[PDB]
Ligand binder design. Sequence first.
Ligand code: NI
Length: 341
Amino acid sequence: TCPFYKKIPGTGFTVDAFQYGVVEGCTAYFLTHFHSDHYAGLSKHFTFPVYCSEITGNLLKNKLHVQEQYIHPLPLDTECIVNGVKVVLLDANHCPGAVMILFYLPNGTVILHTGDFRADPSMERSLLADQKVHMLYLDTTYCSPEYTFPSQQEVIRFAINTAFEAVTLNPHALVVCGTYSIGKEKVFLAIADVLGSKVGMSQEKYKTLQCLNIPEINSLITTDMCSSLVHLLPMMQINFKGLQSHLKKCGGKYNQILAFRPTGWTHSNKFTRIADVIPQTKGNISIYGIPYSEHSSYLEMKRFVQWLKPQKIIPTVNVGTWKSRSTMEKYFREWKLEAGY
Ligand code: NI
């Protein structure tokens, strides 16, 4: 049974609600982004209208085989009418194709559903600038002040400089980057660009990347592993055993691996600056955990909400425990008292 925070009152609509069977009253199912917790339940046998971005719709058709007649892609930053209700899709600054959805209810209420997002000050000059929002369905993944991490630009600077130094010292080093979903493609594309290489990967991952509308992608990636000195591997293989095994397969071309695991936040963020990050090393293998986030930090979240001034907030993450729910409610009240709305 579909939970309340996935339903949009006053409409036939649900958001990211595909794992509940046929939802009673739903005439259109919105999908914010192609992450498995959110698409869970979609397959080629699905027969209701799915509304999403162009990029999400590429992935639904090619990766999950949803039939074309049920895929309804909408352009961003554009007022569209869906089953009699005005909607807008906005870039969520999460993974490729991720959106926030603005719903203009027939009674005059305005609802923003953030999906998954990384709040940015640029959002204060989107179509959100122009009107009041009554209800906010909020990505509260990191809603506590302990969750700090650097900008994506500082993290990429660290990675580029680390990879370039290592491979210039040793032209026989291979770089490996872990992946298990879409998102975070800047990590491996920025490192391959500094090294003058394409990125090598499996046929399955190449297929996924071909759906993403990234400019000049045919110039940046390949399935020919032998021609590439940056390889992508499943995240589960980013450990000393998995990397040892991979280096064997390279036929004595390489004699060292430098590997990256982009994580979200980890408790080593509470003590260490990005500049001071060091790897775990065993012999000729080193592994860096880098804090590349596609969700808001606490301070980015707080700034966005204090700017938007919603009348009510509905969290969409961390909703299963009373302790989480109590914590989040306290922060929302502080923010409102401090700002005056
Ligand atoms: Ni996500």
